[PDB]
A paper describes a structure:
Eukaryotic genomic DNA is folded into chromatin, in which the nucleosome is the basic unit. Here we identify [name], whose function is unknown, as a nucleosome-binding protein. Cryo-electron microscopy structures of the [name]–nucleosome complexes reveal that [name] binds the nucleosome by its tripartite DNA-binding mode on the dyad and linker DNAs and interacts with the nucleosomal acidic patch by its newly identified histone-binding region. The [name]–nucleosome interaction mediates linker DNA reorientation and induces chromatin compaction, which may facilitate PRC2 activation.
Consistent with the gel mobility shift assay and the mass photometric analysis, we obtained two structures, the complex with two [name] molecules bound to the nucleosome (DEK2–nucleosome) and that with one [name] molecule bound to the nucleosome (DEK1–nucleosome), at 2.8-Å and 3.2-Å resolutions, respectively. Consequently, the two [name] molecules are tightly bound to the nucleosome in the dual-tripartite DNA-binding form (two symmetric [name] SAP domains in a tripartite DNA-binding form). These tripartite interactions between [name] and the dyad DNA and two linker DNAs were also maintained in the DEK1–nucleosome complex (Fig. 3b, (i)–(iv)). We found that the linker DNAs are sharply bent in the DEK2–nucleosome complex and their orientations shift toward opposite sides compared to those in the free and H1–nucleosome complexes (side views). In contrast, the linker DNA orientation of the DEK1–nucleosome complex is intermediate between those of the H1–nucleosome and DEK2–nucleosome complexes.
Residue numbers in the entry:
A (entry chain K): 56 to 68, 81 to 188
B (entry chain C), C (entry chain G): 10 to 118
D (entry chain B): 18 to 102
E (entry chain F): 20 to 102
F (entry chain D), G (entry chain H): 30 to 124
H (entry chain E), I (entry chain A): 38 to 135
The structure:
Amino acid sequence: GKREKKKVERLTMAQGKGQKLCEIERIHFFLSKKKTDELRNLHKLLYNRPGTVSSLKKNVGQFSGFPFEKGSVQYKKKEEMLKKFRNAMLKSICEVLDLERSGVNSELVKRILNFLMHPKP
Amino acid sequence: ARAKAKTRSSRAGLQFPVGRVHRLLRKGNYSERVGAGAPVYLAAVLEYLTAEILELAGNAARDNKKTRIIPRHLQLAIRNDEELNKLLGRVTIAQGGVLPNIQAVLLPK
Amino acid sequence: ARAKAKTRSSRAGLQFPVGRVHRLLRKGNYSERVGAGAPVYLAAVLEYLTAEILELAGNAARDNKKTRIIPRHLQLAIRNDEELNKLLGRVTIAQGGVLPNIQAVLLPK
Amino acid sequence: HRKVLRDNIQGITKPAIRRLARRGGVKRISGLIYEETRGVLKVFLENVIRDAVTYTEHAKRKTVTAMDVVYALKRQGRTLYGFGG
Amino acid sequence: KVLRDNIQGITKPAIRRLARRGGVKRISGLIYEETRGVLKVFLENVIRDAVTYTEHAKRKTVTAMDVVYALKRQGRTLYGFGG
Amino acid sequence: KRSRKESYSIYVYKVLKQVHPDTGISSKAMGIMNSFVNDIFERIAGEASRLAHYNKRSTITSREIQTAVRLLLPGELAKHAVSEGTKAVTKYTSA
Amino acid sequence: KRSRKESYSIYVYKVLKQVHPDTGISSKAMGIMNSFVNDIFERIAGEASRLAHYNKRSTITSREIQTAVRLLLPGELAKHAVSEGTKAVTKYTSA
Amino acid sequence: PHRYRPGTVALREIRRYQKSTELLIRKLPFQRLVREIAQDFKTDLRFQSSAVMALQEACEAYLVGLFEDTNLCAIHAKRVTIMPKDIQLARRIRGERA
Amino acid sequence: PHRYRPGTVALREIRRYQKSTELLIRKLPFQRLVREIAQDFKTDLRFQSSAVMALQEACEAYLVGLFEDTNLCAIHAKRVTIMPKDIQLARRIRGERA
DNA sequence: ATTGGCCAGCTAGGATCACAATCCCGGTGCCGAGGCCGCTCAATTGGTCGTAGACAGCTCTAGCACCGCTTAAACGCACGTACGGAATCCGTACGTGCGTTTAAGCGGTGCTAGAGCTGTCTACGACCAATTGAGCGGCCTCGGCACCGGGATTGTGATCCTAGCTGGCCAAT
DNA sequence: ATTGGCCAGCTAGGATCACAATCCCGGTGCCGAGGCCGCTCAATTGGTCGTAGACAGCTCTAGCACCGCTTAAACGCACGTACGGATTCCGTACGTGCGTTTAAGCGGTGCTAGAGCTGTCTACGACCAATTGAGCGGCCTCGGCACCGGGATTGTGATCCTAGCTGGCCAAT
């Protein structure tokens, strides 16, 4: 019979159990008063990665707490970022969250994280 | 006393000239001696290949609604057929152009 | 009555056998007739190339402080010489290995 | 007398491919590449052996002589020196 | 007469057109000098072989057949010139 | 009357009429086919020549062409071409 | 007494002694050189053959080898090889 | 007011120059180039037009294939602009060399 | 306690297998492979040892050159790990094809 | 008396419009594809003759098969760290378009080198027979080189030391 | 109530230490390289024949040169978006090093298919002359198709409308 016409092959190459940070009016006031570039470190903690500085104000303001529980592996992953931060920026994260600005490094870690597990007015 | 001369071609049922092939073989000094069936077989082979090419090309012509085969239809026929493209992969066909191939990535979304 | 037989080679001042070349040419059916000076010239050419290869290889041997050429030396000689590498670029030399080439990027800093 | 040697391509073991790559100057190798390169190889050998066995069938011999293999490669455009070519 | 510096006659847009035929969408302005140099190399080789056949024949017109045969040597066989 | 250059055009034409009676072909195409045929022929014949010296054999017979074909044409081409050639040479010997 | 297979070994060995009197050569190397010489020879001779048919010419003379050489060997090889060959054939014709 | 987004007309151009076969390099400049090259090997050469035409078909084909390969490389680097490093690469892999 | 940083021993290995020439594939497995392949073209073939040896030299050379080219590609993508897309690329450019 | 709902302003997504690139269809006039004819010479036909290659028969080298120790390599898995690759944001270089400049292309004319042919004749190579010594294989023998044990040197990875910085409390403001 | 310094602690880089890898020096033996011998076949030598190819001469094709006009393509610039590429971070997939398994390697024996050579002979192909009809060039013509223009469709970019948030005013607070 006739051949079959074999064609060629070619090489072709977070809104958990809390109130939103925009609904928590004091935190919304801080997020409106600070320059957007302050928020990067917070969004890094909130999502384990900071997004665009264009969306960053939305990304922090729309957050309503972690869905998780304290002591869990995700909480430990939040402690990793907070322990890798430094006390001045941790006290700024306290200030914009309306948290009091005192504490040793490990207290700043646990106190910020206990709040961001359940952020409320 | 002389049988009616009929070309070996006829004896073979081919369109390509067998005798011409024979002559070329002996004129090419491929060997001091050339068997009788060799030019027959060779002619047949060439004929076949030609037929194949011309078939595919003409198909491609009917796809361009073109009745007459031009160098592009050969290029299309060959490159679209894997078996030939392997045969003729080192070959550049004048006035053949290229087979349309825009790499996927290059197209916008 | 018979002059002292001296090989055409001697007449040419070559180490490669001219007569052997001649014989091969006629045994290869390259052409019905082979001129007299063709095997001379051919032998000379081959001889030259051989000489070149061996020279380079032996050089490379003294660089390995090795007195005796082994295939690796040939591979080194050839690939390190551009002109030959062009000549013998499609050639794979058994037991030749590779010319040492660690791409710059791969080295740590 | 006659035994099928199926599924023998895995005999081109991972470390062998690793050694060949090192000869190539390859520093770091994905672990998935090995099945790809076996497939490549099989293809190559298919072609070579095809041509070799072809020559042999023409000579009416039943044993593919080294001279066949070299001549096959020569047609592949990959001339091999060192076997009487 | 001595024709000189004609390689610029392979004008930028002509390289751009060839690239488009290749399916090239975007071209760095550095390509042009590279592709001219490449092309000069190529021609050098082809023309050396063609001229060499001519010399051997003792013709003085380089003939289309000579170019085709040169390419054939390079493994670049050309169909459509009487090969 | 001057020296006349042989080509294959007319045969290609005949073939083409067998395959596509309604279809014609441009001169340029014919030059392509001429060159192509010549090239294939050269490859096969040269292969045969070498494959005959290889065996210290002097004569290209159907066997050498067949072998050469198998070497050059890849797969389905090889098969069909071989089969056809065999058919043709059979028919030739029968008459 | 059995069929004896021709090679070039002894000539290669002579050449080598002219180039590196202190140096020897392994058998394997010799097999390489044999193959190499054969390959070069084949390329040149085949080129000559084709370049002679190309001209409707029947005979390979010094001119065809010379041309073939120029085609195959790149640059400095071409030059020196041509020069040497010319020298040799000159010396041959002189005696 | 009308202005194509960069890369649109480019894609239209590609579709055009692939559908087409005509010679992409102006003939007369290429001719004068060829003659310039020949001038190094033999003085006062004469070229049949056909010969020049053949060389052009060959040189175009060569470059076209070169750019195909080059493009392949460039995409394979997740780039889109082909750069000289991509051509040099293409050649090095083909076994052509600098 | 001693442990080479990853990529050191690798570089040592490279320097070794390039200084060396010996056959990188175990001979007997390769042999059995060759025979497995032949089994499709002709039944109960016999191979001179020399033939197998030739095949091996060829196969090794081919792959080695393939990896050289592949590595070139990989570096050209600023990567170090060669991957199958790099081999496929190498072949596509050489004119070998899937 | 001051500022949060109401409206106005700004922005993003969907919808809409403009318009120009592509397609489709007819018509048209062009010129190359295709047929015809007559002549030529390469293909054919028959006969003859050497001749090389199919064939059987032979000898034996070399491939295959199987076996059993000895390692070295292949293997699997644990551990971890360098890598690939997703994100990101900068500069900008490359595209696109416009207006101006260049020369490619056409075509037309004129000139002449040199392609291509033919005829002469002759040096060169095929050929044959006789000659012979260069090259082969077989034997032998002996130096290069793989190896290995011991040192010496370098490269790598792990470690210590010196330095600058950070936090809470105390001292000074 | 704020600011600067101190002790303790920490981290980075330059250095130090240890060890493995690499290298180097020299002794060992072993086996493949290299030399010698006689034979033989291939190379050489000489004389003959013819024919391939060098050379000369003629024709005339076609390559070159040059000009002018038209115009599309090339060029140069402005402009701005998308892109390349730098940066960072993360996860895991490689790499590395253990112990374990396994089958590669080696050497040996036994078996024999099948490589290789030789002799027979004749079917097949070379060569020749005589035949001739297939194939080439010239010419004539006539349909395919490239081009043009109008209409239609699609695709692309530009635009508008609506939904949402933010800012200001009057009315509410």
